[model samples]
Target: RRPFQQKPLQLWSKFDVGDWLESIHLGEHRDRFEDHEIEGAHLPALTKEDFVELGVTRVGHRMNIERALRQL
Candidate 1:
């Protein structure tokens, strides 16, 4: 079976972004992500401030997203 991990993060869909948030323990913001239509294409540019604007106010949560984004 194939895994989504094989795909480049930049090409991931909004749903894929949501699944990533879930994997990172930030699933609580899944709807917010969907609401903003934040696909992987928008990920690399997201900063802590951007996360706040997107409703992710928790410091650690933002850090997690930032870290994962860099990992990609």
Candidate 2:
């Protein structure tokens, strides 16, 4: 007949649209929280652009802080 275990392979390939939508929703929520913490530290009136700039700069600061703390 066919090869071996064709039914399992067919079932696996079936797309679950609900799972895909849930993944996108969760990703957006996570991004919001990530951006919020970076923005919320200084002031409430901070714009999204301000947070994006600060978030980029903080990458270097985080690396340096981790390196410094590791030596202590």
Candidate 3:
């Protein structure tokens, strides 16, 4: 049997990932609201704590998974 494939592994600090995901999710929400003519005042603020509760550390990671599924 061949040896296990070795790849560069990267781990983002929890805080950093939380921040990034929050930014991305907020951006998406903002765009959706804007498309529907919803005012910013009606939008709720997103927090890092919410990100942790959602179990999404990085939005890019989630986006990548979505794109892959769409390709199928």
Candidate 4:
């Protein structure tokens, strides 16, 4: 039997940028993140560099997302 396909972990559609950020407990700095949400960018398939581009410039938030990503 063929292996079943597994969906890749994603933060975009699953949780829009704002929602994802909020869920991850991002502090009160959402202007740019909202901008990303508007563009439907910087939500999923995020690499460390991608997060950096989206202004995820916090150790706490960065590591949190990293740990979540590793689960996939």
lDDT for each candidate structure: 0.83, 0.33, 0.35, 0.52
Model 2 worst lDDT window (10 residues): 12-21
**What TM-score quantifies how close candidate 4 is to the native fold?**
0.47
Clash totals in order: 0, 0, 0, 0
List, residue by residue over 1-72, the lDDT tens digit for candidate 3: 111112111222333223332444444333333344432222233344443344436776456434432442
- Model 2 Cα shift for residue 38 (angstroms): 16
Q: What global local distance difference test value does model 1 have? A: 0.83
Per-residue lDDT tens digits for candidate 2, residues 1-72, read: 322123332232212211221233422223434444422122333444553454524444335433432332
1-72: candidate 1 lDDT, tens digit per residue: 223366788888888888888888888999999899998899888877788888999888878888887887
lDDT of 3: 0.35
Ranking by lDDT: 1, 4, 3, 2
> How many pairs of residues collide in model 3?
0
Top-lDDT structure, candidate number: 1
- TM-score against truth, every candidate: 0.84, 0.22, 0.25, 0.47
Ranking by TM-score: 1, 4, 3, 2
Candidate 1 lDDT at 6 equals: 62
lDDT of candidate 4 over 1-72, digit per residue (tens): 111113333424423444544555663435665655532243445677766777877777778866754554
lDDT of 4: 0.52
C-alpha RMSD of candidate 1: 2.0
Model 1 is weakest, by summed lDDT over 10 consecutive residues, at: 1-10
Count residue pairs with overlapping backbones in model 1. Answer: 0
> Which regions of candidate 2 deviate over 4 angstroms?
1-57
lDDT value, residue 36 of candidate 3: 42
